[PDB]
């Protein structure tokens, strides 16, 4: 093996192109406390009118 030496005058040899980010690792389990009951009264008490 002999590493061929590079020309000091060479510009960048080739273009760099973007690639969309790969998929992530699978998501972990959620592990929540059991959901609570809100009832229609509290569902309505957070109903906001239109602006």
């Amino acid at each position: 093996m002999v590493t061929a030496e590079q020309d000091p005058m060479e510009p960048p040899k080739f273009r760099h192109k973007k690639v969309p980010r790969g998929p992530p690792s699978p998501p972990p389990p959620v592990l929540h406390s059991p959901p609570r009951k809100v009832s229609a009264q509290e569902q309505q008490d957070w109903q906001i009118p239109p602006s």
Partner: protein, 96 residues
């Protein structure tokens, strides 16, 4: 080329607004109407990657697997769903 037209518009729509799940559901439906497998699962898994906590998407995927008689796929999908969200009972009830 009509399939190409629809696929390009769906892909650019989901690229512009990546958080709009309605676009993913519509994409899965339209694509499911003719080419019943493979890329349907691909699109739905991509949507799951975007947000895996969206129960309607899970139910939609399961239901589209029941349509096409894929029972073993659907049961693997339930296993993944219940092992991801053990505290939502919609998935458990559909499974049982």
């Amino acid at each position: 080329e009509f399939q190409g037209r629809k696929r390009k518009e769906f892909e650019d729509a989901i690229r512009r607004n990546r958080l709009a799940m309605g676009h993913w559901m519509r994409y899965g439906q339209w694509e499911l109407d003719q080419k019943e497998f493979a890329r349907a699962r691909s699109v739905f898994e991509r949507a799951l990657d975007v947000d895996s906590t969206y129960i309607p998407l899970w139910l939609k995927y399961i239901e589209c697997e029941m349509k096409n008689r894929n029972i073993n796929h659907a049961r693997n999908l339930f296993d993944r769903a219940v092992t991801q969200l053990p505290r939502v009972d919609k998935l458990w009830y559909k499974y049982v």
